């Protein structure tokens, strides 16, 4: 039962590897998964289902990993520790992010799965930008919250075009120091 | 005779502020430039190839108005300035520009022109951070083309969540003085 829907997953997560899902049919999962297709019918309604799931999966293992970090004990060093679990977890799973990025335009479930996750960790390096400045370490400069929006959706936008190999692109061996770098400059810069 | 095409591409600008590029058909684009279906085909092979103009006479306007401040004669005051041009350029073209933008999934010749416009912008970003550096008002710290990179892809991901309003965004009036922020900081600072 839970085997099944896993090696449909793992299918998926291993064709997006070769190509996009607009060239992978429902029949490739099947066969991948050793299922029929009406079975695959019986645990996913769609291809671009077991797209959301993957990247469900994927964006939580990143959440989870940050809340991990959050309840544990340099100023450079914190952020780049924190900015580190983005870079490794999407990097580890570059065909689910990659796809999972494409999808925003067509899927609303994955345009709200992304933007929900999003806003959560903005708010989260907000606080802790906040935190930063309550006890003087960073100067009072922009509001925290737009500050906060505006470093994350650089990341998201460098970390997927490194990752793609896009041209303009940081290289991915590059990207960590260059994100950290622009963070802890504009947080405690005045 | 280029009216013709003009008026096409005016009422694809028009027809674009409504609905998506999907939404929108060469019967309406026709209708709307008061010529026929056949005529339509006269002047553009397709509907992605109208937009592909639109973007093309955008992106050139902002490159034009870059051009014009490079030739012209504080540190803050210079990059607000040249980053304004984008805001003004693309927040006068939301249409376009938003349409444009998803273009570059389905579209090459949408997708090469980014490209294209995106590695000319990145590399004169760069040269100023190093005659900035070389004069010693900027520290010798990252690469400055892989900063340069981060900025402007920073700029490409906030600008657009700005004018499409997604959630989360930057408010559209406070879009300028965010990034000048984080690119002032991150050039300057030590
Ligand atoms: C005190 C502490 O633990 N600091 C580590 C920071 C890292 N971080 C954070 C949040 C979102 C992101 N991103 C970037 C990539 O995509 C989306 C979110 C990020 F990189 C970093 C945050 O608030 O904690
Ligand atoms: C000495 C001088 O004239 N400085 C003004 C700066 C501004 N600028 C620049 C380039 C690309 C961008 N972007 C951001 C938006 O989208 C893509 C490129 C930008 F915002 C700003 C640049 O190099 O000149």
Excluded: C
């Amino acid at each position: 039962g839970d085997d099944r829907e896993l090696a449909i997953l793992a299918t998926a997560e291993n064709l997006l590897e070769d190509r996009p899902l607009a060239d992978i049919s429902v029949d490739d999962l099947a066969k991948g998964a050793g299922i029929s297709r009406p079975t695959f019918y019986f645990y996913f309604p769609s291809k671009e289902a077991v797209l959301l799931t993957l990247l469900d999966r994927v964006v939580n293992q990143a959440d989870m990993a940050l809340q991990t970090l959050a309840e544990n004990p340099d100023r450079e060093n914190m952020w780049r520790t924190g900015i580190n679990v983005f870079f490794e977890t999407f990097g580890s799973h570059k065909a689910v992010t990659r796809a999972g990025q494409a999808a925003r335009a067509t899927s609303v479930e994955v345009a709200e799965l992304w933007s929900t996750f999003m806003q959560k960790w903005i708010a989260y390096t907000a606080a802790v930008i906040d935190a930063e400045r309550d006890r003087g370490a960073a100067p009072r400069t922009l509001p925290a919250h737009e500050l906060a929006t505006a470093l994350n959706l650089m990341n998201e936008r460098t970390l997927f075009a490194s990752f793609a190999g896009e041209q303009p692109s940081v290289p991915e061996a590059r990207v960590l120091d260059t994100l950290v770098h622009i963070w802890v400059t504009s947080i405690y810069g005045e």
